[PDB]
Design a protein around this ligand. Sequence first.
Ligand SMILES: Nc1ncnc2c1ncn2[C@H]1C[C@H](O)[C@@H](COP(=O)(O)NP(=O)(O)OP(=O)(O)O)O1
Ligand SMILES: [Mg+2]
Ligand SMILES: [Mg+2]
Length: 431
Amino acid sequence: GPHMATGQDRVVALVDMDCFFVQVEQRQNPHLRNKPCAVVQYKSWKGGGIIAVSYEARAFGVTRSMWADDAKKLCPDLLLAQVRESRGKANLTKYREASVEVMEIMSRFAVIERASIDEAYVDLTSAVQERLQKLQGQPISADLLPSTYIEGLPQGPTTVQKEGMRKQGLFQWLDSLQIDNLTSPDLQLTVGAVIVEEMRAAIERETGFQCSAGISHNKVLAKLACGLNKPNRQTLVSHGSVPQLFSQMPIRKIRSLGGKLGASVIEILGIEYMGELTQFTESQLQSHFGEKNGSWLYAMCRGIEHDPVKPRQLPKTIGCSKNFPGKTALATREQVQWWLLQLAQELEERLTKDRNDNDRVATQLVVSIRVQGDKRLSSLRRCCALTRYDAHKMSHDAFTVIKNCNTSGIQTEWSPPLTMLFLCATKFSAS
DNA sequence: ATGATGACGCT
DNA sequence: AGCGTCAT
Ligand SMILES: Nc1ncnc2c1ncn2[C@H]1C[C@H](O)[C@@H](COP(=O)(O)NP(=O)(O)OP(=O)(O)O)O1
Ligand SMILES: [Mg+2]
Ligand SMILES: [Mg+2]
């Protein structure tokens, strides 16, 4: 009781852009705004693969991974924006540059951990402490939380529209707050939410992009919270909200449990919801899923997690990849060499920009391929030295380290045909 | 015939 | 090192 940790020591937010690549294209092309629209990659195979979808289009059932020709059957008026293609492949530069716009604004408020092209975790523990002193015991107005939901509220003995509900919950939360105790975790979360309102206002003002956010005591809860009221809203998940929230929360919805581990938790334990994990001892969970995973599950199902927000705003690897599906699999040596060069050229461009912007150099080159028949993401990875940002040298070196995979006796050919090439620059050092 | 990426764990 | 998992 007195010595039980409650995982309420930090304030962590997760900020995730709403239909990010779509907003990037809508900002650029006003004709796309407030329309069902999607971002597509490679127009020739069935209109292109959809990689992002506006909320207007989601209402028709359009999803990521859908072929655009198929999406158009669901949504005949769907508008599309195409990803740029350079050197025969998708070029995501526009979206990486937009991401930097957003990450640079977030970084003004606090230390961030870049988690994807469109989201970052924020450790607000310090900013909250300082804001609480300046707020010398002074209450927090609902006007300071105009887009905040309080998960689990309203509740109890007590409107039929969304915003009425939001407000009722926020009112219940604020009315019950203990503002004279600067160490109240619920107060710390609330002030955290005020800061995230400010952050999200800054992003929208300075970029035009809308986003959602979660505010809680750790990364897994903040990420889960972010998604509860997307788009263009933020959600506070308190420690106290966890038992009800988790009581019907499918295990696969929790970060890192969406794959085989989560499926094994479900099968082995015979459970469906996160909250059901509380029934097991830490030793029991470790017995089934290993020391690290077992400890992690034991704490997480109680709303407790210690994974820190890492101070990292920049990616640790820079890579370029291309698939060659079906009949397009590379079958000749000259083919393989041409495409390695295309990849190397793009990688060179990105590395050179990276070294100028960020004062660092990559020192290792990883070359990965996939062969026909293999369902694995990669069939084979080999590394070599990256000593010069030169595309012809990188492409030549990549060929050298993989050319032995050519099981064939031919000279002119390549077998088995290659269904993927991947060049990744790694192991950065200061420069 | 999703694709193009990116982080991190395991042995 | 090279492979596998999980992720957007
Ligand atoms: N499997 C994938 N393959 C290629 N690009 C992808 C991708 N998943 C996402 N992207 C690209 C395209 C996405 O725009 C961007 C962010 O991904 P999200 O945050 O998962 N989804 P969004 O921001 O679109 O919508 P909302 O967050 O409101 O649900 O990353
Ligand atoms: Mg997003
Ligand atoms: Mg995201």
